[PDB]
Amino acid sequence: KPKGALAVILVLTLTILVFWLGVYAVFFARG
Amino acid sequence: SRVYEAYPEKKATLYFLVLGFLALIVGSLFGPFQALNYGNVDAYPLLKRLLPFVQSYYQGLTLHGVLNAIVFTQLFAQAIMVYLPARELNMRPNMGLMWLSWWMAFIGLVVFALPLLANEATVLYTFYPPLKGHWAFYLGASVFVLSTWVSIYIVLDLWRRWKAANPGKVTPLVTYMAVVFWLMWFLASLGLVLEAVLFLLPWSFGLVEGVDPLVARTLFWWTGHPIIYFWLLPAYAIIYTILPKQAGGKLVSDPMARLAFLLFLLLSTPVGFHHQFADPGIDPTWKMIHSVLTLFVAVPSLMTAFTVAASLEFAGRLRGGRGLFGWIRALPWDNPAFVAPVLGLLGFIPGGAGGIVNASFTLDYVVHNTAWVPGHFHLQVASLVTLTAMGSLYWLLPNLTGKPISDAQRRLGLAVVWLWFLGMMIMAVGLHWAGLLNVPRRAYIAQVPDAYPHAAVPMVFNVLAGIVLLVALLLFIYGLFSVLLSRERKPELAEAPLPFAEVISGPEDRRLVLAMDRIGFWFAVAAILVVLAYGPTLVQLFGHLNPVPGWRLW
Amino acid sequence: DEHKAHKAILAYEKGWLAFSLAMLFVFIALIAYTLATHTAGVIPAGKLERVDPTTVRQEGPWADPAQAVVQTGPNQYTVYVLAFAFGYQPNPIEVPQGAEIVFKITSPDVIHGFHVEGTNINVEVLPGEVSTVRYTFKRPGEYRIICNQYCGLGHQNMFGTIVVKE
Ligand code: HAS
Ligand code: HEM
Ligand SMILES: CCCCCCCC/C=C\CCCCCCCC(=O)OC[C@H](O)CO
Ligand SMILES: CCCCCCCC/C=C\CCCCCCCC(=O)OC[C@H](O)CO
Numbered sequence: 099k100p101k102g103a104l105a106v107i108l109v110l111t112l113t114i115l116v117f118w119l120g121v122y123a124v125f126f127a128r129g
Numbered sequence: 130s131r132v133y134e135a136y137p138e139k140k141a142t143l144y145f146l147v148l149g150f151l152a153l154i155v156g157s158l159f160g161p162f163q164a165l166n167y168g169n170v171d172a173y174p175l176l177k178r179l180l181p182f183v184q185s186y187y188q189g190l191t192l193h194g195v196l197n198a199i200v201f202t203q204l205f206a207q208a209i210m211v212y213l214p215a216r217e218l219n220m221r222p223n224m225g226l227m228w229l230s231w232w233m234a235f236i237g238l239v240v241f242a243l244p245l246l247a248n249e250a251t252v253l254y255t256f257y258p259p260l261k262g263h264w265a266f267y268l269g270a271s272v273f274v275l276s277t278w279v280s281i282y283i284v285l286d287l288w289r290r291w292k293a294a295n296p297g298k299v300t301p302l303v304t305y306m307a308v309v310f311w312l313m314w315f316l317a318s319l320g321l322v323l324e325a326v327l328f329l330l331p332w333s334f335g336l337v338e339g340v341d342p343l344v345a346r347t348l349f350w351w352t353g354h355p356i357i358y359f360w361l362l363p364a365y366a367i368i369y370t371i372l373p374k375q376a377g378g379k380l381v382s383d384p385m386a387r388l389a390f391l392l393f394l395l396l397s398t399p400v401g402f403h404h405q406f407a408d409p410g411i412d413p414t415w416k417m418i419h420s421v422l423t424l425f426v427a428v429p430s431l432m433t434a435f436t437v438a439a440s441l442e443f444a445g446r447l448r449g450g451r452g453l454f455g456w457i458r459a460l461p462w463d464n465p466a467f468v469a470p471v472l473g474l475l476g477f478i479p480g481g482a483g484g485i486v487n488a489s490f491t492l493d494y495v496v497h498n499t500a501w502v503p504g505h506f507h508l509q510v511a512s513l514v515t516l517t518a519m520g521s522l523y524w525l526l527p528n529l530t531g532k533p534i535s536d537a538q539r540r541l542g543l544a545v546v547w548l549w550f551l552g553m554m555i556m557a558v559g560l561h562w563a564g565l566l567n568v569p570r571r572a573y574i575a576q577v578p579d580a581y582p583h584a585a586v587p588m589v590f591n592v593l594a595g596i597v598l599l600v601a602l603l604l605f606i607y608g609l610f611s612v613l614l615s616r617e618r619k620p621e622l623a624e625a626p627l628p629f630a631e632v633i634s635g636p637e638d639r640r641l642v643l644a645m646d647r648i649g650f651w652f653a654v655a656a657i658l659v660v661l662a663y664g665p666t667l668v669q670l671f672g673h674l675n676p677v678p679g680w681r682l683w
Numbered sequence: 684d685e686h687k688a689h690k691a692i693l694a695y696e697k698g699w700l701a702f703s704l705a706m707l708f709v710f711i712a713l714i715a716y717t718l719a720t721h722t723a724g725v726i727p728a729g730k731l732e733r734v735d736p737t738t739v740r741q742e743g744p745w746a747d748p749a750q751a752v753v754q755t756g757p758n759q760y761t762v763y764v765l766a767f768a769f770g771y772q773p774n775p776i777e778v779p780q781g782a783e784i785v786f787k788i789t790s791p792d793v794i795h796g797f798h799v800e801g802t803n804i805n806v807e808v809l810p811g812e813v814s815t816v817r818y819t820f821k822r823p824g825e826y827r828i829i830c831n832q833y834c835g836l837g838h839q840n841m842f843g844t845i846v847v848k849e
């Protein structure tokens with residue numbers, strides 16, 4: 099298994115999710 | 130040089146690269162001042178003492194955007210995506226056309242540059258009507274961009290010649306990238322060519338009284354989305370086909386690389402309403418459709434993330450690294466051609482995360498036209514693309530010129546790329562954060578020092594970024610000039626093969642490669658998608674035009 | 684070995700790509716949700732509503748800013764806002780909390796933004812076009828309007844005010 103490539107995509111997923119869900123929270127807070 | 134007589138394409142490649150890096154240098158001079166500005170520090174008095182022709186923050190921001198994001202990126206794309214496919218095929222580009230594309234770019238540049246420098250087109254790099262720039266800015270810029278139509282013809286010619294010699298062979302990888310990339314660009318470019326020919330040119334010449342701002346923006350963003358993929362793909366061609374060798378490994382999938390590029394050809398253009406989520410008179414169902422297709426255009430970079438990470442992991446394992454992080458430390462961190470794109474790829478993680486937020490329709494109302502946007506795009510173009518081009522100085526330059534890089538020049542390149550990277554990271558934090566605080570983009574905010582009190586903390590990151598990047602830029606200028614003006618020349622460097630990677634062994638899905646090679650077909654699909662995505666809206670706009678007078682507010 | 688690594692890389696890549704697909708689709712569904720709620724009022728009306736920027740300050744609903752706020756329903760007000768170089772009229776815009784506000788914004792000159800700080804109102808204002816957006820203010824008080832589209836050298840100081848009355 100490509101463990102290092104999986105770590106990278108993990109960091110990427112967590113970053114996408116923190117950004118997206120963060121802004122989604124902001125959006126509703128200003129709604 | 131007997132090298133330039135056999136490979137005249139090295140000299141024309143060099144001219145594109147050098148012109149591009151000169152534009153990057155000049156446009157980037159304004160960057161530190163803009164970063165200090167977003168840190169609430171006004172250094173424009175100093176900038177104007179040094180460059181007395183600069184009349185305003187906004188004139189400097191027009192120059193920065195045009196020179197860095199339009200001129201430099203285009204020149205690099207024309208260097209890379211002509212020269213690399215020509216070397217892979219070992220065939221000569223049509224040199225008459227190559228030269229003509231260069232002279233068009235150079236001439237368009239010089240012509241647009243005159244009103245820009247004279248404060249006659251301080252309309253920014255988006256030039257949105259009714260803001261009305263001098264006719265020479267629109268003409269110079271039109272001729273600059275049309276230079277790329279010649280490049281497209283160059284590469285399609287290479288490919289057709291090769292295919293005629295080699296019927297029933299699939300297109301070689303680098304060539305396949307460049308062909309789909311230039312065809313994508315042709316379809317992409319038609320928005321702006323239309324905006325220019327039907328509206329901007331006749332208007333700035335005095336032939337029509339006004340321009341409808343909504344139709345001009347709609348045609349602009351048809352092109353302005355895919356132009357970003359046009360900046361990005363030449364860095365991707367290096368990252369897929371050259372970087373794996375520089376890292377000490379191999380590209381892990383040729384078919385996955387072709388597939389990413391094929392997704393970019395289909396999805397780069399029909400998506401521009403994601404720049405118009407806040408625009409009146411475009412129907413919301415259409416915005417949602419472009420939002421969905423925008424999230425799809427994310428797929429090829431999501432795919433690229435894994436193909437490339439696995440290639441780098443592979444190289445690190447070849448070089449003795451073990452564990453879950455040992456592969457990272459085993460990579461050639463002493464080589465700037467390796468380090469620059471890798472750091473740019475790391476910043477591209479939060480870069481791409483912001484882009485997926487921006488694409489999300491209603492979420493765009495939180496960030497649109499705020500400092501977040503520049504936060505996102507400095508990760509993508511000013512960091513990934515620019516750093517990948519900077520790292521090319523370290524293999525491409527010697528290959529084009531026979532000029533050797535010394536040990537001392539290699540180390541200074543490492544320092545430049547590290548500081549550039551860290552500066553972009555630090556500024557991304559301050560701008561993302563200031564944008565979440567409603568600080569607007571495109572604003573001389575240091576001139577309203579009490580308007581943004583909540584932003585005091587990200588403002589310190591912007592000041593720090595401005596200083597870090599000033600230092601990176603100065604070292605870059607010193608470095609580029611040292612290798613450019615350098616004493617020695619070893620022609621063997623100009624004659625060594627480009628450092629193209631091998632592809633890892635294992636099959637390779639021929640059914641898929643063959644399907645992907647149906648380039649006429651995929652091109653017609655990409656075109657139909659653009660008719661479907663844009664046709665209905667543009668038929669409604671063009672049948673209800675409302676041209677309005679032009680203004681000069683600077 | 685290379686055969687092995689290659690097979691394993693593609694296997695896991697297929698997995699990542701399915702996952703990444705799933706996540707994008709969840710975002711799509713979460714976006715569709717916003718579109719069904721009152722929060723989607725800030726999306727501009729998709730409707731072309733053409734006006735003449737050269738006479739907008741002389742005739743019609745933008746020509747008298749003190750009459751720009753008009754009750755259009757039992758719990759709804761329509762506000763005719765002019766964004767111009769370099770300010771907004773009326774100033775202040777005064778509206779009751781908890782009413783639905785339909786903002787009809789246009790410009791007599793160049794493009795301006797209309798970003799109401801603290802809210803999702805964030806709309807481009809095009810000369811010759813009316814931007815229509817809806818919002819209900821839940822909290823009384825003073826909200827700043829920021830121009831976020833470069834409109835010339837007065838851009839950084841182009842602000843307005845909304846006052847939401849208890
Ligand atoms: C080259 C430059 C550009 C890239 C690329 C780019 C990508 C995207 N952007 Fe964007 N952008 C938008 C959406 C996206 C989306 C969906 C993506 C996507 O294509 C992103 C996909 C990418 C990813 C999902 C990241 C993948 C991660 C990778 C590939 C790195 C992996 C790491 C590795 C391999 C390293 C590991 C190695 C180790 C050693 C650990 C939207 C709206 O939807 C707007 C309008 C916002 C507004 O309100 O105005 C916007 C605005 C802009 C502007 C402003 C235009 C203006 O002046 O008004 C520019 C210049 C720009 C540039 C760029 N943008 N963008
Ligand atoms: C020394 C590095 C540089 C720094 C410190 C820097 C800083 C800045 C800042 C602070 C802004 C926001 C200004 C505003 O919204 O008013 C900006 C705008 C911009 N930057 Fe850079 N920049 C740098 C290099 C790059 C380069 C390399 C690219 C492209 C390859 C680039 C492209 C842009 C463009 C496209 C904009 C937006 C222009 C506009 O809104 O009209 N920057 N930069
Ligand atoms: C505000 C945020 C600013 C901070 C920005 C930082 C973000 C991450 C920084 C660097 C990533 C580097 C990760 C990998 C670096 C590896 C170098 C290495 O492993 O060196 C091995 C040794 O040299 C044998 O070759
Ligand atoms: C060896 C090199 C590493 C050294 C790098 C330091 C690393 C990060 C920390 C601070 C730098 C901050 C620079 C910011 C400069 C002044 C901030 C400012 O303008 O202060 C405003 C204040 O918040 C209201 O008045």
Ligand code: CUA
Pocket residue numbers: 767768769794795796830831832833834835837838839841
């Ligand atoms: Cu009005 Cu900026």
Ligand SMILES: [O-][O-]
Pocket residue numbers: 353354357484
């Ligand atoms: O432009 O994304």
Ligand SMILES: [Cu+2]
Pocket residue numbers: 353354355357401403404
């Ligand atoms: Cu885009």
